[PDB]
Design a protein around this ligand. Structure first.
Ligand SMILES: Nc1ncnc2c1ncn2[C@@H]1O[C@@H]2COP(=O)(O)O[C@H]3[C@@H](O)[C@H](n4cnc5c(N)ncnc54)O[C@@H]3COP(=O)(O)O[C@H]2[C@H]1O
Ligand SMILES: Nc1ncnc2c1ncn2[C@@H]1O[C@@H]2COP(=O)(O)O[C@H]3[C@@H](O)[C@H](n4cnc5c(N)ncnc54)O[C@@H]3COP(=O)(O)O[C@H]2[C@H]1O
Ligand SMILES: [Br-]
Ligand SMILES: [Br-]
Ligand SMILES: [Br-]
Lengths: 350, 346, 171
């Protein structure tokens, strides 16, 4: 049940007691070497030092780290057990680290199974070792600059997504949609998602410092998963409306594609089920109407799903009379007038 | 004084903050008492007695000497310097270090604020009645507040879209509970993000006045909108009193950020069922919002008409003479034209 | 209650304590040490850390890198506490300067035990014993003083030989 690397980095994320202590250590320029566990195996490699039983605090961690040596914490992290200790792990344990402190850190994490942090006195750099794996913490200021650059590109990817999405809707009304038109929106939908994943990683590392960025990212992305779901159900090559499993499977195959493959429209076609040939890109497609219904304001997907499965195509849905929509079981009178008005208003703009 | 009130006294643009920034560049550290009275003199040891006007330069130089500087309550004078604070050790504190424990303990006993600039951490911390706030560089606060202003602009764009949808549905007489809870949710988010940006602006002092201008435009009109949405769609059949409206708005503020998401929780506050079927149910607005949109309409006049006709769909349908039936006919002609113009624009 | 002159002997070169203080001086850390532990001293001590370790010169330096004061047992064979904040009664009067040194003398007066204070800014060791104050002097300076006296003793020895020879002849 030893902790994983990703689990350990969370323990050092902003807003935690450990991270508060490490920030004090960094401002003190003392350097440090911390062991996040204590048992018989850890004590076997711990030399001399001091044996103390004190409650953990960020200030207490800094003061004990003013002394040369290593501080050891209990497994639960609630107590500081030892300070000034000399770690003496088995030298046979391999490590490609530099310096006595950092090489001792990796060897110690490997032998005991617990994480070990090493703050460089000369470089003010925090590094955590867990089972031969290494992750370097980054100051929240640098991460925020990375995420704000990505937010700028995400805003532009949303602007281009909106322009090509509007173009596809206009083509759906005129019934001259091509596969190239759909795969143009598919590419932009995925690019928005991928930049979103980049920013999400930056948000997690920011801990409490990323709460403000969490709001900005969730609003800009918001509705992207709905859009990717709607384009798949509207334009999947399989004639019958896709099952809930089939939609998720197609979206997963899209995520599996490389960044270089997203630029290839033919690769995007394979995921939907169309041929990879250049002639297929020019081919006409007939939308089912899922996207058009979603455009209608205040229309829940449950209502639109019955109508799209019933009428089959966006052109039986458009030509429908308000009474025809009502016949479908589960569609109320009032909703039939609202949908018939919605499709008519879509025809006026385009 | 409250903690946040004290932060304004240490905020950029004030004399104290100028002095504290001087102290930070010197790496001297400091320990300052923001008050002087008979009780404070009892805990001040030795030191020097001086009567000079406060200045940023005077505060830095006096803080080069080990010990503490004491200022008068109004901050216009420096009373003593180099003092060794000796507060009662019985006073408990969860601080670490001799300087900082003396700061928190001293603030508690005297009742005045006590600032402590750490030499080892180059960090300013102010204590007020057992409370702790660490000053933050204006650059970090500005980045937080500008992301929040961007998010607030985006929240206003969504607020306008869902707000237009509700009014247009009011004309069409097909309002659902979900339509109302969408506007209620979006209104609260503008409120809460606005309060966050407000605190950052206060801490920013003179650097945040420009953000205050941007913030005051984005918020403006939010309090009126929350009041009117409660009047039109409160579950109690009788039009809610001002006391009931304010109680509903307070209960909204009491909800957590997670509850503002859940539409069913918002329904509970208004008095509707928490079930999903209730969210789909049709609701009929009272018409207070529509009448308020009509120019030159008194709230008392619109309140009489709303109590009589009940809904926005009896106000529209009512003939001009029906509105006068007791109300001034001249106003009745103005109400029918105003209601018709709203239907044409939507 | 050892006397002040007795305390200086405990801090004289060649002792364990003096080895630790010389480490502290080379480190420029400063320190505040209490050479005794009883129930009354603990009454004046705050949080800090509680350790039961044998004294060593190296061990004393590292604990004195942390802010606060370290407390030793009466005989000095064990170290009881580190990072402690002694808070003696401010009523005890002293015209000392700085929070550490005035706190040092007040602590020695109240407890009756010696308390050493090494100044970070001046690299000066001062010991307080029952309201008395003595500043230690580096062995280099004392040796220069004592060699001046040895020169005067040799010249006084020659002068003694001349007057003694003069007296014997007169006898
Ligand atoms: N076996 C060895 N082989 C080669 N060189 C050796 C060595 N042992 C020590 N040194 C050298 O001595 C420097 C200072 O050692 P010190 O223990 O004073 O200062 C140490 C000690 O406070 C701590 N540290 C390093 N390894 C440690 C360990 N295994 N356990 C506890 N603390 C450790 O990190 C400090 C800085 O280490 P850094 O490597 O930068 O600097 C080291 C390194 O250059
Ligand atoms: N009663 C006591 N018990 C244990 N250790 C004691 C002590 N009094 C002083 N020290 C130790 O001496 C250090 C230096 O004190 P100094 O007087 O040079 O310089 C002091 C002094 O100018 C100021 N300071 C702390 N407490 C104060 C107080 N109550 N009144 C005025 N100034 C205070 O903060 C400076 C740095 O304090 P810091 O804690 O960083 O570091 C302290 C602490 O390690
Ligand atoms: Br290093
Ligand atoms: Br400090
Ligand atoms: Br000093």
């Amino acid at each position: 049940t030893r902790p994983t690397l990703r689990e350990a980095v969370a323990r050092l994320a902003p807003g935690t007691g450990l991270r508060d202590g490490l920030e004090r250590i960094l401002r003190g320029r003392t350097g440090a070497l911390i062991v996040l566990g204590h048992d018989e195996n850890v004590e076997a490699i711990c030399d001399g030092g001091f044996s103390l039983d004190v409650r953990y605090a960020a200030t207490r961690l800094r003061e004990l780290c003013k002394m040369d040596g290593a501080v050891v914490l209990s497994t639960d992290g609630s107590r500081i057990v030892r300070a000034n200790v000399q770690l003496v792990p088995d030298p046979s344990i391999p490590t490609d680290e530099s310096g006595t402190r950092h090489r001792s850190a990796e060897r110690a994490a490997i032998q005991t199974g617990y994480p070990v942090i090493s703050v460089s006195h000369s470089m003010n750099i925090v590094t955590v070792y867990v089972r031969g794996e290494r992750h370097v913490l980054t100051d929240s200021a640098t991460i925020l600059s990375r995420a704000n650059q990505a937010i700028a590109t995400l805003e532009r990817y949303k602007t281009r997504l909106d322009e090509v999405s509007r173009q596809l809707s206009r083509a759906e009304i005129e019934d001259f949609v091509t596969l190239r038109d759909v795969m143009t929106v598919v590419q932009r939908l995925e690019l928005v998602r991928r930049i979103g994943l980049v920013i999400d990683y930056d948000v997690v590392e920011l801990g409490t410092d990323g709460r403000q960025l969490r709001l900005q990212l969730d609003e800009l992305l918001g509705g992207n998963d709905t859009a990717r779901e709607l384009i798949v159900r509207d334009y999947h090559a399989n004639p019958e409306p896709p099952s809930t499993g089939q939609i998720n499977a197609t979206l997963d195959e899209l995520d599996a594609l490389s960044d270089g493959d997203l630029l290839d429209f033919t690769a995007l076609a394979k995921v939907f089920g169309y041929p990879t040939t250049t002639e297929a890109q020019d081919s006409t497609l007939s939308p089912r109407g899922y996207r058009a219904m979603a455009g209608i304001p205040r229309l829940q997907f449950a209502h639109a799903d019955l109508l799209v499965r019933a009428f089959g195509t966006l052109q039986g849905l458009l030509a429908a009379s308000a009474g025809d929509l009502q016949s479908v079981d589960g569609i109320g009178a009032m909703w039939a007038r609202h949908v018939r008005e919605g499709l008519s208003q879509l025809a006026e703009s385009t």
